[PDB]
Amino acid sequence: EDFVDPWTVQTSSAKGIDYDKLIVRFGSSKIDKELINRIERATGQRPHHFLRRGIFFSHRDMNQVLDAYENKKPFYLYTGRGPSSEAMHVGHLIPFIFTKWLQDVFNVPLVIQMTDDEKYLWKDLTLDQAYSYAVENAKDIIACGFDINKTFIFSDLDYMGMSSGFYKNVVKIQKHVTFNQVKGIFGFTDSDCIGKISFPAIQAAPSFSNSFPQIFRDRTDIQCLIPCAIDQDPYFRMTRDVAPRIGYPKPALLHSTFFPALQGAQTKMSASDPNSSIFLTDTAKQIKTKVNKHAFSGGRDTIEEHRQFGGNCDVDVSFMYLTFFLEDDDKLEQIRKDYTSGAMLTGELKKALIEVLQPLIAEHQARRKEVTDEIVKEFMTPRKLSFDFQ
Amino acid sequence: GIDYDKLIVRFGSSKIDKELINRIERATGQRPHHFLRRGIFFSHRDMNQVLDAYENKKPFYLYTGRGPSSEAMHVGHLIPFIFTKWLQDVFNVPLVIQMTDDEKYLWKDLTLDQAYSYAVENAKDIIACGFDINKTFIFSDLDYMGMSSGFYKNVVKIQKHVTFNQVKGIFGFTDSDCIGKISFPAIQAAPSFSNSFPQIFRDRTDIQCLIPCAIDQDPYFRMTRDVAPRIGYPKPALLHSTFFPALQGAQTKMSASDPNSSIFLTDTAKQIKTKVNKHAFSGGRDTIEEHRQFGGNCDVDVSFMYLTFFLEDDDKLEQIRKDYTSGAMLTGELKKALIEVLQPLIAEHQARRKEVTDEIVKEFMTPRKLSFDFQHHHH
């Protein structure tokens, strides 16, 4: 009942998908209180709200990452973006917001893959468009605050032709994965182009440190941690499988839930449905309108009934959004209590969310405007990142 | 051996006739190479387009390749190179040579480093054929892919336009093959387009490409010719060579495996003599009496087939052919003739190969502008 994969995301329950059942089906492990406390201990920092609230709820070998970090051994962060267009919605920002926190708390180098080739193979795009979207989307990623001296954002199309180690790993991986394997993992068929069939190796490749010689200089032992939306897991479930078969360490994973579509947690927000998403370029006006008109309500139909019986936070999309963006834990709790008791009407809850998203988006736009051509260029230039590994 | 006429029809290519051969002579001002005169290079695709372009002073470039399965290369491997080298001198055009170390890594039980090392070693033998270093770029797929601003981009464009079903029916791929093999065809196809070599053709996208190769490589190019239009590029032209026969018969297939499959480039004078005498399948009669009355058969005699590939002098070749067929010449004498031709050939190659220094191999494999100028203007 919780179908999930690299592109599509379906579920049939207003409360969202059953992530506990998904963990089991994926074979990953749940992020428990014990692990959350160990992360706090290891770092000396209070865990990000995404972890406290179960937004990042699943993982693979995080224990290993914590071991390595506790023993002063290095590890690096790796995440990515499919640049399907210049238009990005708030849902896309979840993993990046978290990765930025990860990079600050652990203080480690970050690698961000821009799959312009992926999007070229799958969508009706020109190479220039695809590449252009990677560069434009990179500005939105840089707007999240990543340290220019600790992070390399790269275009597949560009980097493939300027790395003495990337393509090499891509081939090693290509040899250790069959068509049957990828047909079962991603659902490919005989009619798909050969580019799609072999693509997974591209996305698997950045999991190995020697893919970035200008960063790790031939070392093949640095632990890799991949924070991503749960639906990306099949790429790395595959990656973890081949790693050993080719003498490389398995990458660790940190999974996040889906950011809800405006009409209900049954679907994730997707540009493939603009009415379901809030875009990073939406005006203050459009944000208010989308929330007021499209945000599914867990409250009662009439205000009288709402006062009498109170609302249901478990299916209310507006409350769900506050869960992702309202940092103050007490403020959120009060709203939960007041909404549940009917003390707060959905219209007010709605107003509350709007007052949170508008500044968030307006601020992101302000930051994005600050990334100049020279800045994007540097971020996207293979180079050494203030960190010595040898 | 194999019926090539019925092969030309199955493949839908074109036969290289005398008209075409004369045309090449006029266009080059040279006597056409013996492979052409003797039907060794018997088939083509668009060779007339290439000649039309050359005669109108338009440019074109050569593209051929090597699958470095090991360090053991044999006389059969040199055929397309010997011919391509001739084409280069004769037309005076730039040449691109692909060393598919990735293909071998995918298909053979080798490590990336082995595959790569073979490519470098094989490059020496290839260079030993005398290619002009100012006119030819030899590259490793593993190396070039990681340093070319245009190679990967073309591979991706190609991948986007070829389906698994397509390669399934062309190369016989199955669901159990690794994904690397499924998409490899796009790699062998890519060098057919000039902008895979920005450094050499200055980003030009319309340079005519001529690919000399053994017909078994054709499937890759029927595919390349098929997708070219679909991605805005001209189709590559082709010149096909026949299969070089294995010592035990044109019936069987060679192999860099069994050293008795053919004459290897590292064989000694003594080894060549031994191989020919002991292993060269004979078209001679069962007995000397039968031979004197009914004569030998050159169409199945491997030693003679060898001579058609390496005996320069036409009259001398015809004399041996006439005498063996008439029975005047015994197969032992024929054998002796081939041995006298081969030993100096292998010796010469081994000597020139020794002349190939590490630096030389490196320069040949270093992407660079070649000694040809290409202009490309726009705004």
Ligand SMILES: Nc1ncnc2c1ncn2[C@@H]1O[C@H](COP(=O)(O)OP(=O)(O)OP(=O)(O)O)[C@@H](O)[C@H]1O
């Ligand atoms: N709201 C969301 N919550 C979680 N993951 C999301 C969300 N929206 C998109 N993603 C992720 O982005 C990746 C691609 O998704 P999808 O193809 O739907 O994006 P899209 O509709 O093409 O929009 P875009 O072109 O801006 O990327 C997948 O990992 C998908 O799960």
Ligand SMILES: NC(=O)[C@@H](N)Cc1c[nH]c2ccccc12
């Ligand atoms: N959205 C997409 O099409 C994904 N393929 C983008 C992506 C590539 N590599 C990654 C690593 C971690 C998370 C996401 C990614």
Ligand SMILES: NC(=O)[C@@H](N)Cc1c[nH]c2ccccc12
């Ligand atoms: N021998 C092999 O395995 C061939 N795949 C080598 C090869 C690569 N590209 C080519 C172009 C023309 C002729 C031959 C080739």
Ligand SMILES: [Mg+2]
């Ligand atoms: Mg998409």
